[PDB]
């Protein structure tokens, strides 16, 4: 049906692939961040935000992928093929989910506009030669 | 996080258990329904509604599941066992997705209150022994 | 015909000749930056700005150049000549495109006036011997110096 | 990306594919026309029109493509290969740029809308079977 989840939030897969895949934190770390900062609101019976809804759906989808993959690896005979599957998931869907969770957590925490400006700025930065840029990478911070 | 997607929309995973598993249409049929009725809105850059958001996310996760399963079967040379994983996938992830699509397409087409009342009444009907069970089961509709 | 593309935008090639070649992001980086920030406009049916127009024309010409050079390489069985051909394309036209892509993106982002002032100051800095200039080149950036967003 | 240069000017490549590839005047003729008519404006420090902008960029591009090709031929030892490569440029690079140079000059000279109508009418003419095709092909004219 050709749908982009980021398009409603003013983003795009093109805009998030603008950042390196070695940038987005791990799914464990992001799920922990969420459980810590917005558990009482994700488990809540309220449409608190589109970001909340999307995060719920995304956490559930990661669970549906991990369960399938565990059942699979259990069935497969070769731990080698098991690790091949693991690499495939972690590099193909793991990245998508890292992007998704990062985007939505970051938005809830800082601001959608803040996060998009951060995307463009960090992309231009990491693409710019070091001698002609600020030496310290950008970062998002609630601390003044 | 023990999040239930329906809890936000006033339902629960156990209220939909009022309906059997053989009740829900095929993913194919429900995706066709969506493409027919709410394609322009799902593909929209707007948060038209939580149902739209959730349904977009749901389609993306089904694509992630199908992609993994197909890649697995293809990179595999013994497909006779592929029927086992297909059966597992359907029986589990497939039923969850059929329950998720139906809820949302219905709550868009008819209404959330209407759908919850339908669930209650269908639970009555199907709890009723067949000897005293009318044949004119309840059905969601916009006609008399 | 003696045409300077920059003249229309208040600049020249003498104001950008100072900028070293190590100043410009590689073409792919600059095509990615244009795609990420202005794809919805460049792909639009509107004349939103002379910068958009020039970026469109520049992207098309790079594409034609790449199509000629790849064909040439495929026709060259000597990878040494292929490397010599690539080195020519990267030094003569890759630099020209890198400068043209940078100028227009930077203008769209910051302001043509700001970009020209930056060019003036960078020329002051680069014309200056190292023994007498600061070691940290002037910087054009949307972020503050700390690089922390809130 | 999916950029069409003519899309901003209210056109496409599907609307210029109407005109046969051998319709477009040669690059030399099209540059002489541009010089004569709009040298003082293409060399101007002014955004007189998007057509001027695009035409400047196209001229600079042809120059770069001719520079690469001359260098290549010079560094090339086989005259047959040299002729083949220059033929390739003429068929693929020469066409795109001559189609671009024509569009913009004709627009500057007659009108964007006039040129689009000309494209449509010429498509009619060239679709017409020859027995009913007038020999007086369509042509752009001011007088």
Residue numbers in the entry:
A (entry chain C), B (entry chain D): 1 to 144
C (entry chain B): 1 to 150
D (entry chain A): 1 to 143
Sentences from the paper on this structure:
The inner shell is an icosahedral capsid formed by 240 copies of hepatitis B core protein (HBc). The N-terminal domain of HBc is mainly α-helical and assembles into dimers, which form protruding spikes at the capsid surface. Peptides based on the hexapeptide “LLGRMK” block the interaction between capsids and L-HBs and inhibit virion formation. These peptides bind to the tips of the spikes where envelope and capsid are in touch but are distant from the hydrophobic pocket.
P1 and P2 peptides bound to the tips of the spikes at the dimer interface and altered the whole protruding part of the spikes as evidenced by the low local correlation between maps of the same variant with and without bound peptides. Model-building showed that peptide-binding splayed the loops at the tips of the spikes apart. The splaying was transmitted throughout the protruding part of the spike tilting the ascending helix α3 and the descending helix α4 outwards. Peptide binding induced the same structural changes of the spike region independent of the HBc variant to which the peptide was bound. The two stronger binders (P5T-HBc and WT-HBc) have essentially the same spike structure, whereas, in the two weaker binders (L60V-HBc and F97L-HBc), a large hydrophobic side chain is exchanged for a smaller hydrophobic side chain, increasing the size of the adjacent pocket.
